Design a protein around this ligand. Structure first.
Ligand SMILES: [Zn+2]
Lengths: 69, 63, 203, 101, 142, 140, 141
RNA sequence: AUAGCUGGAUCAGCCAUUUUGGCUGAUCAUUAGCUUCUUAGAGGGACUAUUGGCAUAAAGCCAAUGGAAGUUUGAGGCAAUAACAGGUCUGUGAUGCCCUUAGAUGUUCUGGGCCGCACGCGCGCUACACUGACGGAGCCAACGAGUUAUCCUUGGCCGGAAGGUCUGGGUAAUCUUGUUAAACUCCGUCGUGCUGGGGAUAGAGCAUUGCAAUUAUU
């Protein structure tokens, strides 16, 4: 099972854990943490306007993102 | 040491009860001599490379 | 130079770079594992894996087919998807770019090394005709080696991604990278070892 | 002012061609804007039925074909020449019809 | 530079024209705001509540690309495969009421005009708006 | 004047072109070559353009209409139509040796661009839905 | 995009049924008997509540207004052609079906069809299909 | 001119435009000449030519350039010969024999039916999920059919596309019809759990077809 309680920890964790890896998508974040799917793409969309992640090629199922360098 | 590549240039025909196994004459590179006959389960054409481990079998035919 | 049409410079730069792959180089990749040359068209550069041509008219016409195209053809399994090449091409493209993102070397080189390492060397055909119904050790041809490697990789990817969150492209990429090197975590390599050990046992 | 359109529908290729040749030759004997033959797409009717009178036997289906060929001809002939050519163009197996307006 | 919608991305243009129509906002959508599934082929409720605007933009572009568009033609081009229960899927047209409502709404806006030989045609204002929105989309990159 | 015409087919698909002298303006049914109905089927259309470059295409204006066939049939038809239109233009209006080198270069890197592709589906025979596939026999 | 430190109060009893706490509202409302998919979507849309938030962050006012709208659908400009029951046998009006009432409506319809002793009634008593289906090969075990 | 192309009476849309226009086209029997693309009468074309090799250096065989064509160019049709104690006397005013014929094994009207089930056997169909489902949007084919009283359907309008409304196109590559299909693709959700994959199964109203739909046509 995957937790979905917004206990103020997930948002801070993902914001400080994005630089750990380069490829960010629903398939890898499920392995990374117990994410139920909604926050999986909501967090990525909310971090898109920030300069942390750079887009490469977006698709309906998934979108490709890379780190700052 | 067990791994030694060899070459096959001719075929002795399609053998085997079911016909799915071919028998061809082999020829090693490091030794131009020592021509052996081995049963190959795959389709073999002229001038094709073979990889073989148990180099001392000298198989004649398959029943 | 440009015309009224947009004509993006990516295509022009690709043509200048001796028509490399979609996003990977073509000049500098060759089969390094011995005993599988003259049967994989690594040098035949094609912008897309798909090629609607004749691949079965001749006895050995299959040997000149593109290795990526043959793998897409192998991925055509599961008659639910028998005939959906666009899905297979997208999955292969996503797997290849993920491999490039993971490791810097050419994903085609990863692919060629994976199929070469997976390809069985010693098999065991059945004598039949009742009796002891035993089996005898037999070597196999390079073309059948590629066929076994492609089938084992595809069936392993389908089994791994049959019921899981991970995508089919990701599972295929994981299988290819795990088969290109020796890590003992590849289902295709396990079947390779199993076929070898049973062949030596009945030899 | 008075354009005569005649039909050249039939199934026998030889007899429809002979009728068409006859009227075209007459249209060339007397100049009437020398409008030549016009060919229309073939209307072929395909029907598939069975061969066995009963239900016993293998699944065999017979397909029959029925095709007809149409041609149209436009002429500027007067009434007397039109009635004359129709009188001489009486042939078996050929159906003709003239539309005035 | 003589730019038309032929050299414009399809989905991006549809969204942009939907937003441009949203600026005017005079569609006056009917009572069935979010309950009609635009025909029998569909089987659930749309997840984008603003699909009326994108539909109107799509019709305007469709009438620009084509000559005449009717209600029956709109149903056959915006229908889809129908899950007829356990039986194999077939193709059925959509509801004509929704398509007629959008056509009437667009004509009230002033983008579609009736013409002879049946159907309708694209208005002069629609053609001018199509050209200007195509120019704006091409020049949107500074 | 300097203009030719040609066509291209891949079975039940046709694409007839009309070459002309110009300075580009290359399009495929209104939309340019860049914008087509599919996205993963773009390099197939781009296959003959990149081989000879765009400098040779800077002196030609061609618009090709496509009608019939599936998506793959259409993209093969249009790329065949543009390729044959270009070689027809360069056969009739520049040196024969230049045409020989262009055709040979296209032949060496040819995804059946120039040569016709006689691919057809065999007629369905009675006894089963498919031409060769048949209903299973209960054998008992 | 939304406030993370929000309020959560697990599940609550509703119409003698349990609504899931940490579950998307579309999924949670299907747990209520008599609720489908389009019905759940339209009632929530007419209730005017944010779709992104799940059922675990709802407040008392929003919960009460949503259920009251469901209790009285036709009064809140909900079209009557969608309603499952129109021109009820007993009520004579297009009454809305619920969860607790359908827990006894099925047996009420069974007694309605059995007391008057139809052919459909004996089919229901004998547990056979009522429509003109076939059971020679199918309808077994 | 029962279909397309161009010129031309025929006009609309702006970045450029008063040599500075590209484009979609609107009408095309208002008018002219042409079939690359539509049609069919006749045809041409390949015969394994052409060398490179086997086979008793015949009959015959393999590979390759050119070409469209090599498998007898492909796929089919008619198909000698006799055999089944095969099927059809419920297609057949095709029929021999047995039986019946008035209280008819004759004609005909109504109701029940061939579809009636605690099962065994078949031929096909549905999903067992993210390769899917839902939702929007760009759109890409062929073969075939239709009214003499009574069929195929367009257009404005009402609707719960299930129907009905009125002028109406069509005796026909002129009207449906260019059967703008599906599959696919751009984007968002369902996140992996027999759940929004899958609709077995039960109930309430809305219409056409049919003396009329119970044993729910659809
Ligand atoms: Zn009969």
């Amino acid at each position: 099972q995957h937790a979905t309680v917004f206990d103020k920890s997930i948002i801070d964790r993902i914001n400080k854990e994005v630089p750990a890896f380069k490829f960010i998508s629903v398939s890898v974040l499920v392995d990374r943490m117990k994410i139920n799917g909604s926050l999986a793409r909501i967090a990525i969309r909310d971090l898109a306007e920030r300069g942390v992640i750079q887009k490469v090629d977006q698709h309906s199922k998934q979108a490709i993102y890379t780190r700052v360098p | 040491v067990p791994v030694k590549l060899a070459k096959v240039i001719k075929v002795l025909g399609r053998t085997g009860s079911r016909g799915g196994v071919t028998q061809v004459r082999v020829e090693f590179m490091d030794d131009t001599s020592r021509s052996i006959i081995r049963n190959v389960k795959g389709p073999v054409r002229e001038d094709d490379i073979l990889v073989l481990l148990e180099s001392e079998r000298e198989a004649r035919r398959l029943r | 130079m440009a015309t009224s049409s947009l004509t993006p410079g990516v295509s022009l730069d690709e043509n200048g770079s001796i028509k490399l792959f979609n996003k990977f180089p073509f000049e500098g990749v060759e089969v390094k594992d011995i005993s599988l040359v003259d049967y994989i068209t690594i040098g035949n550069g094609q912008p897309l894996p798909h090629t609607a041509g004749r691949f079965q008219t001749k006895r050995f016409r299959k040997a000149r087919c593109f290795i990526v195209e043959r793998l897409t053809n192998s991925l055509m399994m599961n008659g639910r998807n028998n005939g959906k090449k666009l899905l297979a091409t997208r999955i292969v493209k996503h797997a290849f770019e993920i491999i490039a993102l993971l490791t810097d070397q050419n994903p085609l080189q990863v692919l060629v090394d994976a199929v070469a390492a997976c390809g069985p060397r010693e098999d065991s055909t059945r004598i039949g005709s009742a009796g002891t119904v035993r089996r005898q050790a037999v070597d196999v041809s390079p073309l059948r080696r590629v066929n076994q490697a492609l089938a084992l990789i595809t069936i392993g990817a389908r089994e791994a991604a049959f019921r899981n969150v991970k995508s089919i492209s990701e599972c295929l990429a994981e299988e290819i990278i795990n088969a290109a090197k020796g890590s003992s975590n590849s289902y295709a390599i396990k079947k390779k070892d199993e076929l070898e050990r049973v062949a030596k046992s009945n030899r | 002012v008075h354009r005569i359109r005649i039909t050249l529908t039939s199934r026998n290729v030889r007899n429809l061609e002979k009728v068409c040749s006859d009227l075209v030759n007459r249209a060339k004997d007397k100049q009437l804007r020398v409008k030549g033959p016009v060919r229309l797409p073939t209307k072929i009717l395909k029907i598939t039925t069975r061969k066995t009178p009963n239900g016993e036997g293998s699944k065999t289906w017979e397909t029959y074909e029925m095709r007809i060929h149409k041609r149209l001809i436009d002429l500027h002939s007067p009434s007397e020449i039109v009635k004359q050519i129709t009188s001489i163009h009486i042939e078996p197996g050929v159906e003709v019809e003239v539309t005035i307006a | 530079a003589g730019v038309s919608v032929k050299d414009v991305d399809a989905q991006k243009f549809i969204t942009a024209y939907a937003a441009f129509l949203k600026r005017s906002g005079k569609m006056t959508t009917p009572q069935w705001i979010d309950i009609v599934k635009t025909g029998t082929h569909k089987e659930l409720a749309p997840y984008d509540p603003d699909w009326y605007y994108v539909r109107a933009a799509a019709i305007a572009r469709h009438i620009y690309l084509r000559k005449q568009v009717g209600v029956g033609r709109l149903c056959k081009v915006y229908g889809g495969s129908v899950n007829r229960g356990m039986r194999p899927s077939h193709h059925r047209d959509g509801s004509g009421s929704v398509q007629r409502k959008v056509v009437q709404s667009l004509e009230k806006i002033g983008v579609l005009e009736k013409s002879d030989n049946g159907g309708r045609r694209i208005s002069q204002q629609g053609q001018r708006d199509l050209d200007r929105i195509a120019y704006s989309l091409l020049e949107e990159e500074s | 004047m300097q203009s030719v015409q040609c066509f291209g087919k891949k079975g039940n698909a046709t694409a007839v072109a009309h070459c002309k002298v110009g300075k580009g303006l290359i399009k495929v049914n209104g939309a340019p070559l860049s914008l087509v109905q599919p996205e993963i089927l773009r390099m197939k259309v781009y296959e003959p353009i990149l081989v000879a470059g765009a400098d040779k295409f800077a002196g030609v204006d061609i618009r090709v209409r496509v009608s019939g066939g599936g998506h793959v049939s259409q993209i093969y038809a249009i790329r065949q139509a543009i390729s044959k239109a270009i070689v027809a233009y360069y056969q009739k209006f520049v040196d024969e040796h230049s045409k020989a080198e262009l055709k040979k270069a296209l032949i060496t890197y040819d995804r059946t661009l120039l040569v016709a592709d006689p691919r057809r589906m065999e007629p369905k025979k009675f006894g089963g839905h498919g031409a060769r596939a048949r209903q299973q026999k209960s054998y008992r | 995009s939304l406030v993370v430190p929000d309020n959560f109060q697990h599940i609550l009893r509703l119409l003698n049924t349990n609504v899931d706490g940490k579950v998307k509202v579309m999924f949670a409302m299907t747990q209520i008997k008599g609720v489908g998919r389009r019905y759940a979507n339209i009632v929530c849309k007419k209730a005017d509540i944010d779709m992104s938030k799940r059922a675990g962050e709802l407040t008392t006012e929003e919960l009460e207004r949503i259920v009251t709208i469901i209790q009285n659908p036709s009064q809140f400009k909900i079209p009557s052609w969608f309603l499952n029951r129109q021109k009820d046998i007993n009520d004579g009006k297009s009454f809305q079906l619920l969860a607790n009432n359908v827990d006894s409506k099925l047996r009420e319809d069974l007694e309605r069809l059995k007391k008057i002793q139809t052919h459909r009634g004996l089919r229901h008593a004998l547990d056979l299909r009522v429509r003109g289906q076939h059971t020679k090969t199918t309808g077994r075990r």
